């Protein structure tokens, strides 16, 4: 299941940790171009008595930073895997989130077979699901760990129509890893709401390596919201799994009198712009 | 002054613009970077049990703030030998990593603990590189590490294949082959057990009494700092013209207060002319307000 | 386990109290004998010890100056002396002895001595 | 120094049920299972029950069983009886500011 949709005005973060107020600043950094198309990748694996082969985690190149967004309940998407070959002949990252912790390490991981699934895949009657683990098969010489407070958190919403859309953007230059996160409320009817929101720096990590590969670790132990179709080319669907690529563009932000960013303009989209 | 700025002894009537009028500052205040967690040095300096000289620990200590002024009372050391840095300036130095190790030896081989030495302990037990930097700390521990009847809690190897590499520990257990007869194991003639045991006793004088030595290893690599010094100097000023030694401003103003609702993770203010107008306060986290004379 | 100490005593405030501990009943492979003070309604507070066969006392942060550690001529029994008694300084004193050398767990303990500072 | 913490301050459960006494010490680098457990009946002196990690002293009943390593330690006593109504203390002999815990008062219903 694949589909395409526009990314109007999302994917902007605070450039630097310096404060400004009521000024028009111009910067130059990797950014998501305005009014670009983002591909949706969906997962279909439910029911125990009946089912079909999942193959629901496509692997993406991760060429010079990506933009991530997804709408879920609390923990459906977990962790991210990087590397270049994801085999025993190369190093690979193992960013994994836990109940109240985050585990990040780099090592010579040999095999990553499958997330452990009971094949029950039925949350409509019994929805007790946890403790899958066993992603990687073996380790090697490595003494790097980042056991820390978990990054993504669930925001409580009542009376319906109160869901949070996550936004993570990943940067890897000069041997360092950068993560910007921000939780955007109000996801009533629009899959990609129009408006403006800004991401904030969260963590830095000196990894290095020449990462050119990206894997997703969606927990298929008990999933939901699984429509399906033969959509291909340029159509619309439902995936709750958004991917966008960054380009080195030039922006111009309108800082408010409160110090926050309200408006922005892409310097290479429109001759008016 | 008017004559001096015109280079003449006669000035016709009129109005002239002499030099500038400026209020000179006074006093001075200093700060330290935003690191608060203190280093737990009491485990290494004071431990109830010590491993053997061959079982010396190679532990890693970092991610804290080291207070070297408090360890003077933690042990009766008097030597405090240092090689690549002055003993007095170990506080205002920032280091990415701190090395700590401790083991028990005999007193006669304490002076041998130094770069460029060879022999009983400098080749079979403990070796250090030629470009070592840091400090060496040692003290007497006879009254708490010796037994009158005999103390066999510490073992030392004396037969080895060769001189082991520096910064490494050899914990092999085998019977050294010191003869043509095959030293399969156990014991026997020409097959000696290298793990001879200490016999620390109060009868021993200087040289044979059990002592304790600790050495701290640093390296001034171009890596980001993790552990640094403290020190406070002046607390704060509210309405005066004072100099600054802050966490990246080094300004000079009459900084009183900032009542703006500043964003949490934003410290340095700017304006339309790219001028710093705000300072993160290391203690109360209260943003200040740069203002010139 | 059941070492013998002195009996209960009553002392006027500001005076000195004599406390003893019988230890020669068994054989101990230790050079240290310890003393423990318990508050009437609170938890334990470690006080210190004296080096057996050496006579070197070891005091704590708040148990020095007025607390006196001493030994006997035969270096078998331990004694505890407290001076400048106050009304709130009343407590029950215990005598403890460890089992093994370089092992600092109090395997053997005294019977206990209670003193009262009142009128 | 180390201010040794013991929680909860007091427990009173029905006899015959295991009671876990949390004994956590503020040791940054750990204690390496250098823990000792003492039970103090009112009146007589405290009596040592467990020395080291889990092993008990000679003559100590098997009911008093403890565990722990580094920072987190827990003591469990099986089949509490009326003679076990006392105050339990734990000590860490790692460095040499020898100090004990706050003391947990165990009461028999």
Numbering used by the authors:
A (entry chain A): 25 to 297
B (entry chain D): 298 to 590
C (entry chain G): 2 to 120
D (entry chain J): 1 to 109
Paper text:
Owing to multiple mutations to the spike protein, including in the receptor-binding domain (RBD) and N-terminal domain, Omicron BA.1 infection can result in substantial NAb evasion. The Omicron variants that have emerged more recently contain similar RBD sequences to BA.2, with the addition of L452 and F486 substitutions—L452Q in BA.2.12.1, L452M in BA.2.13 and L452R/F486V in BA.4 and BA.5—and exhibit a transmission advantage over BA. We determined the cryo-electron microscopy (cryo-EM) structures of these S-trimers at overall resolutions of 3.1–3.5 Å.
To explore this hypothesis, we further determined the cryo-EM structure of the prefusion-stabilized BA.2 spike in complex with the BD55-5840 Fab. A structural comparison with the BA. RBD binding to BD55-5840 described above suggests that the 366–377 hairpin loop displays significant conformational differences due to S371F and T376A mutations. The overall positions of residues 375 and 376 are displaced by more than 3 Å, which probably further decreases the binding of group F2 and F3 NAbs in addition to the T376A side-chain substitution. As a result, the bulky phenylalanine resulting from the S371F mutation interferes with the positioning of the glycan moiety attached to N343, which in turn shifts the heavy chain of BD55-5840 upward. The N343 glycan is critically recognized by almost all group E1 NAbs, including S309. Thus, this group of broad and potent NAbs is probably affected by the S371F mutation in a systematic manner through displacement of the N343 glycan.
